[PDB]
Amino acid sequence: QPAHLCFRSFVEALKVDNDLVEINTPIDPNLEAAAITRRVCETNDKAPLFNNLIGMKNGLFRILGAPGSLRKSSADRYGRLARHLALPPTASMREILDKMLSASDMPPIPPTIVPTGPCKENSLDDSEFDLTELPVPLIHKSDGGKYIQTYGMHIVQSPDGTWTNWSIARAMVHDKNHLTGLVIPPQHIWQIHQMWKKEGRSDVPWALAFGVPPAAIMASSMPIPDGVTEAGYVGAMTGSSLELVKCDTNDLYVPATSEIVLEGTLSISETGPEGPFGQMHGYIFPGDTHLGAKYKVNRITYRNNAIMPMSSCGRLTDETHTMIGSLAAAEIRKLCQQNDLPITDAFAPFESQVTWVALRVDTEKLRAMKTTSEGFRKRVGDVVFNHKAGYTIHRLVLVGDDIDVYEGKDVLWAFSTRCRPGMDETLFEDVRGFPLIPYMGHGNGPAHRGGKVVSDALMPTEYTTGRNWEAADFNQSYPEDLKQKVLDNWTKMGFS
């Protein structure tokens, strides 16, 4: 099976790329595996595969850390991500996000049911497992639990059967047969939970699949529209129907080659302690436990030699930056274009801890609108900040065509030099806020509302007659023939 369609094959691909380190000596799931992975993410090193976990048994489990993190070279920086999607390892971010958006203008390709797959090679019923005995990692020293779920996909379906959602949301072990986790608005797992809670008759049938097809975990991390079944989006994206097998204890369907599958229920009534957790913005507040959603686990199925992927998330750079930020930016680009806004590109700068999105504007199109900064900021912010795709994003930065939004140095340069504080900005207090950002949930104002801004880094003439400056840089302040002469004589002269 190809890498993008089978996690086991993806691990192979990473080896074969010289993008993996296999670690066959014992590694402790209590902090050591995550510490090594954290170091990898902070240095853009090779992904670690821990083949010898302490306390590995019933054959559960090996760990792959840093599955969606960065490579060291500029040329294949995003190669791990490219390998989720059948793209060349030199793919740019534009090409990755275009791939992720491509299915938004295609018919879904619904999944194919098959009778069995590798995820059925082993099973443990509810007298045979104990989640507290498995080698579940402690990821950060102050975490409030062992976070089994950092890179699996939750599967829940609307009561009417018409929407099956796949998404990533964190969860930790509560006791031998339960998890607790985040289930928060406006996320689709929360929207579906609310439908079951309003019907009032039963807990939500649920599955959590770990080590799913890479192309599926990428869609699981993307805010595709309400009501859209990720399986059919991924089918369209990849050009192929995904093969799914039915759960044994419910009627949900899981990828056939899933490494590990939990089957059970998400309660419509019960909660339990959840968190704290070292999170995407780089923080943990020790002791900050709150009531989260509760999950019952009835059955585990798994591949021979199962591998659990793990995100050791926090400070730059990991899956919470490369996937959450970039995939939200992608969806925001599309949303703006569908609202008739002249946005060509969007990206969440890593330097902003993926709390900003830079929007590149087609300024010929903007000029034809015959508008102003105040009006345009206002229009962009209403579209984005009132939509789920904008949930995680607190600052939008509008930039003209000269800026490469995929280059954070250029975004920072534009923001710092073209946006006058206050006057060139519009604050939005009456929109949903992302409480996970420290300045929101641990800050001076409402945790769930406001704190958003549109910062216009378009210069005045970009709305009227066109750009009226040149950069004071090598590229723009010298003619072509001089530039080339300099470059041709560079090493001759003594330079590197």
Ligand X SMILES: Cc1cc2c3c(c1C)C(C)(C)CC=[N+]3c1c([nH]c(=O)[nH]c1=O)N2C[C@H](O)[C@H](O)[C@H](O)COP(=O)(O)O
Q: Which of 147, 137, 171, 192 is nearest to 293 (CA)?
A: 171
Measured CA to CA, the distance from residue 485 to residue 400 in angstroms comes to 30
Residue in this structure with the two tokens 């390892």, named with its chain if needed: 89
Enumerate residues 6+ apart whose C-beta is below 8 A from 217.
67, 68, 84, 151, 153, 168, 309
Q: Which of 255, 293, 292, 249 is nearest to 126 (CA)?
A: 249
Q: Contact at 8 Å (CB) between 348 and 322?
A: no
Among the listed ranges 92-100, 160-168, 423-431, 455-463, the one in contact with Mn ion (CB under 5 A) is 160-168
- Shortest distance in whole angstroms from residue 456 CB to its own copies: 9
3-class DSSP assignment, residue 492: helix
> What ranges in 92-139 are assigned the alpha helix state H?
93-101
Interface mask (CB under 6 A) for ligand X, residues 146-165, using x and -? Answer: ----xx-------------x
Interface mask (CB under 6 A) for ligand X, residues 412-451, using x and -? Answer: ----------------------------------------
The C-alpha angle 327, 99, 2, rounded to 5 degrees, equals 110
Among the listed ranges 43-51, 202-210, 215-223, 264-272, the one in contact with ligand X (CB under 6 A) is 215-223
CA distances from 20 to 5, 10, 51, 145, 257 (A): 19, 11, 12, 28, 21
The C-alpha angle 68, 73, 77, rounded to 5 degrees, equals 35
Residue 221 contacts Mn ion per CB under 5 A: no
Residue 165 contacts Mn ion per CB under 5 A: yes
Residue 398 contacts ligand X per CB under 6 A: no
Cα of 376 vs its chain's centroid, Å: 29
Q: Which of 323, 327, 431 is nearest to 387 (CA)?
A: 431
Q: Which of 37, 157, 187, 317 binds ligand X (CB under 6 A)?
A: 187
- Shortest distance in whole angstroms from residue 451 CB to ligand X: 18
Enumerate residues 6+ apart whose C-beta is below 8 A from 201.
none
Among the listed ranges 34-42, 186-194, 257-265, 363-371, the one in contact with ligand X (CB under 6 A) is 186-194
- Shortest distance in whole angstroms from residue 312 CB to Mn ion: 25
Sign of torsion over alpha carbons 384, 385, 388, 392:
positive
- Shortest distance in whole angstroms from residue 493 CB to ligand X: 23
Q: Which of 67, 79, 223, 314 binds ligand X (CB under 6 A)?
A: 223
- Shortest distance in whole angstroms from residue 227 CB to its own copies: 32
Residues 436-475 that bind K ion (CB under 5 A): 456
Q: Which is nearer to its own copies, 118 or 325 (CB)?
A: 325
Among the listed ranges 188-196, 335-343, 424-432, 469-477, the one in contact with Mn ion (CB under 5 A) is 188-196
Residues 313-342 that bind ligand X (CB under 6 A): 313, 319-320, 323-324
DSSP 46: P
- Shortest distance in whole angstroms from residue 227 CB to ligand X: 10
Q: Which of 367, 380, 355 is nearest to 451 (CA)?
A: 355
Q: Which is nearer to its own copies, 263 or 462 (CB)?
A: 462
Residues 114-173 that bind K ion (CB under 5 A): 167
- Shortest distance in whole angstroms from residue 336 CB to ligand X: 17
Q: Which is nearer to ligand X, 152 or 349 (CB)?
A: 152
Q: What are phi and psi of 271, to 5 degrees?
A: -135, 165
Q: Which residues bind ligand X (CB under 6 A)?
A: 150-151, 165, 167-170, 182, 184, 187-189, 221-223, 311, 313, 319-320, 323-324
Q: Which residues bind Mn ion (CB under 5 A)?
A: 165, 188
Q: Which residues bind K ion (CB under 5 A)?
A: 167, 220, 424, 456
